[PDB]
């Protein structure tokens, strides 16, 4: 049995511009096994009604998924991705940086 | 010997 | 003419989990091997002494085929339950049989294969051995499914080559018994019924192979105006037995004669009492 | 679903001769489904330690089995076969007749 | 160069009964269909609009293949649990992937197939497409098993004919998308760190297919000394995006240029701040 | 289209 830590990346569909509708994405990959918990956050609050792609994997057998929701950026609002996996000692959180 | 492959119905 | 044929049977058990599965092989009228998952040894075993001198590669390989088959049938079972909208509460049966036959020329003659669900013809391999045939408006799906997967292809392979090749081997390894003919011990018995009638019973014992013919004839003529006949039965020692009776008016016993035909006889035999 | 009533035949391996060891056979066939109960009897008593062939069937899909045991005939002892099947309203019993 | 490939995944659920099973199909970088048993509607569904004009024969047929497959995997799962002496208490994964590729000549180029258990290469179809290869001492059995059943045979058939034939069809039915090249929207961003350094980030958005190249280079010579690069990611609208950054001395920005290559570009593209 | 029959491990 082999395990692999997921690689996280939080970002928007288009370049961020306050007041303009966009899409927030949390892209997880290179992980194994498949059981995984992903959560999108708005100022600590767990955003609801979040979709995600169909499960799939790559040549090295690791999986990858895409969670995303619709959102409208603001200078005050803070967004992040909260991910939990067996390979994680504790849920990892990475917040969105509009520059990356 | 018995056939090596059966049928998936 | 010889043949190599198997008979697989699978029976579902709701409560007892995994379905019962059994396979048995035959060469002509002799069972030679078998598999049963409810046996202490859930593996292919011999049923004829002349098999015992076979390597472990054989028994292991066969045990696999058998096991895999039990699985696929387990599936096929649920699959079918689907096709018919049946509950997991009832029991059901799936049977499969296949064989290849050799002609006098000791070469391939014909082959066959067919499935049946709850004792009813379900699917069948056609004579040409390249196409299937649903035989139940339910088998329809299963028909195409197989025709797309091209299952029919290698079944033909097995039947045409593998089956034959091995049949030969078996004939050699078991010549002593397989190719040995054993003619029937004959005799008639008298059994008075009324003051005007008695019963003549023509017997035939310990013969092999099972194919045989008994016929009652009066003064040269033919007969069965009271000819009761019983289905050929097994002796239990590898040979068979069978008898034919007829009611005759007392004092006329000499008139009637029993004729017996069997490959083990140089020529037919006639008895009288 | 198709059902078929079994056909019974009780007999001995060799011709019966008192005091001589032999074999008693109960041969059932042409029946479907396979669940079936066969019992060999000695003066009503259910004989034990009875063997039987491996399950199998014929061209018309019906099954056939052979139950048998070792025994020694006597003019006083009476033997029979007791068979029960779903197609039977009640267990059928056919006793051995050394002439058949 | 194009391709048609699927990715099947099966995960055992101790307690919840039947294992989770999912299949997804792709043409190049576009997912077009999929199957998931947990789903409200357990059956093959489209994932791309250009599929919607397909008959019910198609969807039904595919739904069958999928279903059958989930079954066999369920078996394979227990089978393997056996080979490894593992308990029903733990969860396990079995994955299978296969695809066929077309060359520039728009004709068969290469095909492939391979299984993997608990994230580890297990069994593999060889290049010649006529032999398997255990890639573990456990797969040893599975190897011969397959070689006797001649599974390799029709897998090759599917890959060589069926796969291709259909790939073509898909290309037509979706030419409008699968064949339209979408070049990347480019641009650079400046991010000062100290009064002495800054970060140049070369962006590339909304492109397709995913194959692409970003290269930072100084004075026309190649570079790497501070080249952070992120894995190509999906936009979520069918296109991708990617970026490459580099740290540079304030005042020396003109010495740096970002080069971008993509099939959707008539010729490479050079960006400078 | 998927592969009609998978492989029995």
Q: Is C131 annotated as a binding residue?
A: no
Is it the case that chain D and chain C have 3 or more CB pairs lying under 8 Å apart?
A: yes
Which among C130, C165, C180 is the end of a domain?
Answer: C180
Token pair recorded at residue E67? 């279903």
Identify residues of E whose CB sits under 8 angstroms from chain B CBs. Answer: 68, 72, 148-150
C232 and C216 in one domain?
Answer: yes
Contact E4, E166 (CB under 8 A): yes
| Residue pointed to by tokens 């139950």 | D67
- Residue C138, preceding peptide bond in cis (omega within 30° of 0): no
**E/A Cβ contact: 3+ pairs below 8 Å:** yes
C118 with C232, same domain?
no
Distances (CA, A) of C154 to C73, C158, E44: 18, 6, 29
Q: Is there a binding annotation on residue C208?
A: no
DSSP letter for E193, please.
Answer: -
Tokens of E266: 């008539």
Query: What CATH number is given to the structural domain containing C222?
Result: 2.60.40.10
D64 by DSSP, 3-state: which? strand
- E-chain CB neighbours of C157 within 8 Å are 150
Q: Do E81 and E92 share a domain, yes or no?
A: yes
Structure tokens at C86: 């049946």
Q: Which domain-ending residue is among C138, C159, C180?
A: C180
DSSP labels, E104-133: TTSSEEEEEEEEEETTEEEEEE-TTSS-EE
Q: Please check whether residues C115 and C40 belong to one and the same domain.
A: yes
Provide the CB-side half-sphere exposure for A28 (13 A, CA): 29
Domains and CATH numbers, chain A: 1-100 (2.60.40.10)
Helices E56-83 and C140-149: crossing angle in degrees, nearest 10, is: 70
Spatial distance between the Cα atoms of E44 and E25, rounded to a whole number of angstroms = 10
**CATH number of residue E19's parent domain:** 3.30.500.10
What angle, rounded to 10 degrees, do the helices at E56-83 and C56-83 form?
140
d(CA E118, CA E10): 10
For residues D81 and D12, what is the distance between their CA atoms, to the nearest angstrom? 12
Among E71, E74, E77, E96, most F C-beta atoms within 10 A, so best to mutate, is E96
**Helix C56-83 to helix E139-149 angle, to the nearest 10 degrees?**
80
C220 and C238: one domain? yes
In the three-class reduction of DSSP (H, G, I as helix; E, B as strand; rest coil), residue D24 is classed as: strand
| DSSP-derived secondary structure letter, E182 | B
* Contact between E235 and E206 (Cβ < 8 Å): yes
CA–CA min distance E149, chain B (Å)? 5
C223 burial type by CB count under 10 A (0-12 exposed, 13-18 middle, 19+ buried): middle
User: Between E97, E116, E119, which is nearest A4 by CB?
Assistant: E119
Same domain, E215 and E242: yes
**Cα C57 from Cα C63, distance rounded (Å):** 10
Residue A55 contacts residue E24 (beta carbons within 8 Å)? yes
In this structure, are C68 and C198 located in the same domain? no
Asked how this structure was determined, the answer is X-ray
**Closest chain E residue to the Cα of C61, Cα to Cα:** E145
Q: Are residues C119 and C31 in the same domain?
A: yes
Which residues on chain A are in Cβ contact (under 8 Å) with E22? 54-55
Asked if residue F2 lies in contact with residue E69, where contact means CB atoms within 8 angstroms, the answer is yes
Tally the domains of chain C.
2
Comparing CA positions, the residue from E193, E194, E186, E195 lying closest to residue E257 is E186
Phi, psi of D25 (to 5 degrees): -125, 140
Beta carbons within 8 Å of E136's beta carbon, 6+ residues apart: E120, E121, E122
Measured between beta carbons, which residues in chain A are less than 8 angstroms from residue E118?
A: 1-2, 33
Say if residues C25 and C31 touch (Cβ distance below 8 Å). yes
Shortest alpha-carbon distance between residue D42 and chain C (Å): 20
Q: In three state form, how does the secondary structure of C93-162 look?
A: EEEEEEEEEECCCCCEEEEEEEEEECCEEEEEECCCCCCEEECCCCCHHHHHHHHHHCHHHHHHHHHHHH
Please state the separation of Cα E250 from the chain's center in Å: 41
Domain with C258 in it: 181-271
Q: Which residue of C has its CA nearest to F1?
A: C148
- For every residue of A25-60, DSSP letters joined together read EEEEEEEBSS--EEEEEETTEE--S-EEPPPEE-TT
Distance CA C19, CA C90 (A): 12
E8 and E103 in a single domain? The answer is yes
């Amino acid at each position: 049995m082999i395990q692999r830590t997921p690689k996280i990346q939080v970002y928007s569909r288009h370049p961020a511009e306050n007041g303009k509708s966009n899409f927030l994405n949390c892209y997880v990959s290179g992980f194994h096994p498949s059981d995984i918990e992903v959560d999108l956050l708005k100022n600590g609050e767990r955003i609801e009604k979040v979709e995600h792609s169909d499960l799939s994997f790559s040549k090295d057998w690791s999986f990858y998924l895409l969670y995303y929701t619709e959102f409208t950026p603001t200078e005050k609002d803070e967004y992040a991705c909260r991910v939990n996996h067996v390979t994680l000692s504790q849920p990892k959180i990475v917040k969105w940086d509009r520059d990356m | 010997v018995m056939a090596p492959r059966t049928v998936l119905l | 003419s010889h043949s190599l044929k198997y008979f697989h049977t699978s029976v579902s058990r709701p409560g007892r989990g995994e379905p019962r599965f059994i396979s048995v092989g035959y060469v002509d009228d002799t069972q030679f091997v078998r598999f049963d998952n409810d046996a202490a040894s859930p593996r292919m075993v011999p049923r004829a002494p002349w098999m015992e001198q076979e390597g472990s590669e054989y028994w292991d390989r066969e045990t696999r085929s058998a096991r895999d088959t039990a699985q696929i049938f387990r599936v096929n079972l649920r699959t079918l339950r689907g096709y018919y909208n049946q509950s997991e509460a009832g029991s059901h049966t799936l049977q499969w049989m296949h064989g290849c036959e050799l002609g006098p020329d000791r070469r391939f003659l014909r082959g066959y294969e067919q499935f049946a669900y709850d004792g009813k013809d379900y699917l069948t391999l056609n004579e040409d051995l390249r196409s299937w045939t649903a035989v139940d408006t339910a088998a329809q799906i299963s028909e195409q499914k197989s025709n797309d997967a091209s299952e029919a292809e290698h079944q033909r392979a097995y039947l045409e080559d593998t089956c034959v090749e091995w049949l030969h081997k078996y004939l050699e390894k078991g010549k002593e018994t397989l190719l040995h003919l054993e003619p029937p011990k004959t005799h008639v018995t008298h059994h008075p019924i009324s003051d005007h009638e008695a019963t003549l019973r023509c017997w035939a014992l310990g013969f092999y192979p099972a194919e045989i013919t008994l016929t009652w004839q009066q003064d040269g003529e033919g007969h069965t105006q009271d000819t009761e006949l019983v289905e050929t039965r097994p002796a239990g020692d590898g040979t068979f037995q069978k008898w034919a009776a007829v009611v005759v008016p007392s004092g006329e016993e000499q008139r009637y004669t029993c004729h017996v035909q069997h490959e083990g006889l140089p020529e037919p035999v006639t008895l009288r009492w």
